[PDB]
């Protein structure tokens, strides 16, 4: 996953928007990759970062974690710089056995995408209805 | 949200498998739909569970939570022992406030579908080649 | 009361408005039904929910409770998303004996509607005058 | 509010009964009108009481409270014993702030009159068939 | 397993009666679902109650249960409630180990319904006559 | 009243299979009518046993006890003689008072068969789907 700029799309309710994730770098002090759209004023921007966690003396498994930050930045007309008055997010953790293969890990990755793209979760997220 | 049979296509590293979930009833303590996999034993494998919390606690926010359970077998016995041994799994939480826009929630959802289609996230999971 | 969408009307001071209550679902963790108009941004919306309480080892009777939420959502022109700066409500509890019949329960239900629709309460609610 | 004789028509499961209340005086401790039912003994049955609180406590809000008392008899004795035994009742509170709009208060009131006319609330009370 | 309205038929001594079971939801502290009868008075109802339990450690097995059914109502010399005595009861549970087949489960369910219909039990139960 | 061979058709998931119980006399330990499946191995696996008792001094209630056993044997890798690994069964009882008669017994056993055949129990048992 050697970082490179990737444009993501089919975004939003209609699946029409795109976003661009430009690597900013990888933070060596915590094992976290970071890419963003824009970035002139980071507080106001959408960001995606990924942690890397390997098996260890105190870790039974390894992880890939994606942190998704989606702020809403507002200012009233007549004023200056906007500020974030909402922070929307997602927190995606993948966790796997050291004896697991690519196909099995991929099932979890693609099951997630296929299911989040399915009505059960589309409604759980857009309508926020109780499972029912 | 509303539960109905879910068919998930284009699954796995090849993008060729199909999974079928059966959301047949919601847990009274956790608000969790049991998305059983099709097949009496396979149902326990590749199982997913889903709950949508309400802003009923002093956080004043809510979370849509999907838990993906993918334990797998290693060589079942003639005694009808499934030999389930190893496991892959994921925890994905969304992680919004009460004033959030449905469109923004949709972006977060579709952005993840897009991230799961990108080498920046895929290589780190299927080939376990992290960001750099 | 198998939930279905119902339009309510003769609403407001003149008895002219209507509202639509679309089931969102029933929360199995607390026995509470929920329906609303709209819902894209739940904090800002009118909602009606109903609890169900049955006789028990620690309950002498059974109840039907209706919770009515009527927020006032405001933003100033030139800004963004409105927020609620008023929460108006009603809390309606019905409670009955296990030996009571439908007619008796209906008397309480229709007595309430007939009386809330009568000047004694119309003025108690719109004018907020002391009983006098 | 202002008290005068109240006639409530279209009462009961059939919508055919008429009740008559007599709001003849307000309780000095609770601010409660005694809406006596017509008839010296029937007055005690199907009795309703009403009070409008003022924002005189550190809540800075107020409540219109109506209490419906519908105890009923089972087979009076020749000794002139009314045999009142079983009871149906309701407590309805409105539950507004000092800055509320009269129109919004009217909506809450009329919305309840409308809810009491809907199967979503009726079936749960008259047939005791709750939401689902 | 959505606990929606259930209609039964072809029942009673001559197989000619019908019954609609109207669910009232599930007890939050007891996994058993309950379904209401057509009677107006709760104290007189013959409620159907149902549960599916799926244990892990402590039992490592599965259980499904239904509770049946009715107290007998009557009056004599004047009353208050036409009161009921439990007279007609049955209790059916299903039990099996983990990882069972759906066909195995189906046979136990269908075998019982067939056994109940069969003369050896349908007449033996009516008469309470041991089969020898 | 009499012991007889039982043929049960239209059973199993598809409602098409037939099971046959060969009579096996009486067990005078408990007054149990023992019947078992008509085959060399089913004789060892699959069986139904039944007893009926009048009230004991500790009941004032008649009892019917039906035990349905449908275990599955598996052949371990090294066995010649397969044995039961999955002991599936059902526990079926009835209880009636000393003043109950034919209709009380009839609606219970016929309502039970109707319940077993209902879509709620078909799904609750065959799939093990909780009624939520």
Numbering used by the authors:
A (entry chain B), B (entry chain A), C (entry chain B), D (entry chain A), E (entry chain C), F (entry chain D): 1 to 132
Kindly provide excerpts from the paper associated with this entry.
The coat proteins (CPs) of single-stranded RNA bacteriophages (ssRNA phages) directly assemble around the genomic RNA (gRNA) to form a near-icosahedral capsid with a single maturation protein (Mat) that binds the gRNA and interacts with the retractile pilus during infection of the host. The canonical ssRNA phage Qβ has a genomic RNA (gRNA) of 4217 nucleotides, from the 5′ to the 3′ end, encoding the maturation protein (Mat); the major coat protein (CP); the minor capsid protein A1, which is a read-through extension caused by a leaky stop codon for the major CP; and the β-subunit of the RNA-dependent RNA replicase (Rep). Like many other viruses, the CPs of ssRNA phages can also assemble into virus-like particles (VLPs), which are not infectious. Through a native infection without engineering the amino acid sequences, we found that Qβ CP can form diverse VLP capsids, including the T = 3 icosahedral, T = 4 icosahedral, prolate, oblate, and a small prolate form elongated along the 3-fold axis.
Recently, T = 4 capsids have been observed when overexpressing the covalently-linked CP dimers in ssRNA phages PP7 and MS2. Here, we have observed under normal wild-type phage infection, T = 4 capsids are also made, albeit a small percentage (0.5%) of the overall number of particles. The elongated faces of the small prolate consist of two triangulation numbers, Q1 = 2 and Q2 = 3. Figure 3A shows the five forms of the VLPs from the wild-type Qβ, each containing 240, 210, 180, 150, and 132 CP copies for the T = 4, prolate, T = 3, oblate, and small prolate forms, respectively. Though all of the 5 forms contain 12 copies of the pentamers, they consist of 30, 25, 20, 15, and 12 copies of the hexamers for the T = 4, prolate, T = 3, oblate, and small prolate forms, respectively. For the T = 3 and T = 4 VLPs, both are formed by only one type of hexamer. The T = 4 capsid has one type of hexamer with a θ angle of ~170°, defined as a “less arched” type.
